[PDB]
Design a protein around this ligand. Sequence first.
Ligand SMILES: *[C@@H](O)CNC(=O)OC(C)(C)C
Ligand code: NA
Ligand code: NA
Length: 220
Amino acid sequence: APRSVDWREKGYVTPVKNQGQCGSCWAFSATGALEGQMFRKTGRLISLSEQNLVDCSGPQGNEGCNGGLMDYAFQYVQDNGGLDSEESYPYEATEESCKYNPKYSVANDAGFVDIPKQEKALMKAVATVGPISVAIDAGHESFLFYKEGIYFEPDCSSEDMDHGVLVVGYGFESTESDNNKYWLVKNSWGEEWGMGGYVKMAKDRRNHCGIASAASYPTV
Ligand SMILES: *[C@@H](O)CNC(=O)OC(C)(C)C
Ligand code: NA
Ligand code: NA
């Protein structure tokens, strides 16, 4: 596979968004992955509505601001036959009744693909598909204050994830400890967090923070 990949350079990735004080991380991860696959299909980058997923994808198993799963969101889009644009169905950071309107749908999918729970399989998927939805353990103060560098948290769990994010690539940089490899991860806490809203997560350090344990993407 390539040693470095950055799907932002190829135009697959919208700007960083902010979920606010709602547990909708899973909706931002899913829109990010579908935004990439729709651009790969059509050549158009269109920002998609998280509020649409928060309000409407409960029948697929999601729970609004109390959590959800990207795969449940991809299933909703398939079941529903559409997903509205971000401009048409803006984000309010609170759960409300479903207001989906197919006239303003700009995306679709036909299911999704779950990646084997190995970082090597995640690398192959990032290298060949585009941005991938992933779940991580972000429940540590170090993750809140992250500014730059390769994030490594020794108390991070590989099994108990609490936050959905989006792998847009991977790469490397020389470090003190010679643990030089990272996943390039888009968060949804605004661009003031981390590095313009991105974080470099330690790669090939034993599935650090669980980044390869629930990885998937939508099929378009
Ligand atoms: C993020 O706002 C809420 N966390 C969440 O839904 O975690 C997973 C279920 C692990 C995606
Ligand atoms: Na919070
Ligand atoms: Na279903």
